Amino acid sequence: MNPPTFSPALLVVTEGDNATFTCSFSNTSESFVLNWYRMSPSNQPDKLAAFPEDRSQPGQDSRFRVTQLPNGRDFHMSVVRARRNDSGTYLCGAISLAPKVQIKESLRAELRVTER
Numbered sequence: 659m660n661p662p663t664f665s666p667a668l669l670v671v672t673e674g675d676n677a678t679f680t681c682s683f684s685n686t687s688e689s690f691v692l693n694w695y696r697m698s699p700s701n702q703p704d705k706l707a708a709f710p711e712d713r714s715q716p717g718q719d720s721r722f723r724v725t726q727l728p729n730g731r732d733f734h735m736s737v738v739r740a741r742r743n744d745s746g747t748y749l750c751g752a753i754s755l756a757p758k759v760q761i762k763e764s765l766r767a768e769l770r771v772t773e774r
């Protein structure tokens with residue numbers, strides 16, 4: 659497995675707007691999960707959303723969405739109604755579920771949410 663890529667490296671939006679990063683990941687045949695994390699400011703990496711949508715736990719209402727685009731390689735990681743407090747760093751992490759369980763992370767990207 660190759661690590662995903664996460665773009666753009668810097669996204670600047672105005673408070674109230676949506677913000678969308680693109681995670682690109684080219685899978686093996688094998689099952690995988692793609693997690694979107696907020697990395698700072700941090701307690702630890704905080705998982706925001708995942709692909710596939712998690713069915714191991716009850717659903718959770720969220721401003722954060724991960725969608726697979728019809729090309730299958732690209733995924734949108736979106737925030738709705740971005741707040742100043744959403745400013746920080748983010749990454750996407752691919753988890754291979756077979757044959758060996760491993761996680762490979764993208765480089766970080768920064769979200770800057772500016773005052774209206």
Ligand SMILES: [Cl-]
Pocket residue numbers: 662663664665764765766
């Ligand atoms: Cl990257």
Ligand SMILES: [Cl-]
Pocket residue numbers: 709710711
């Ligand atoms: Cl899904």
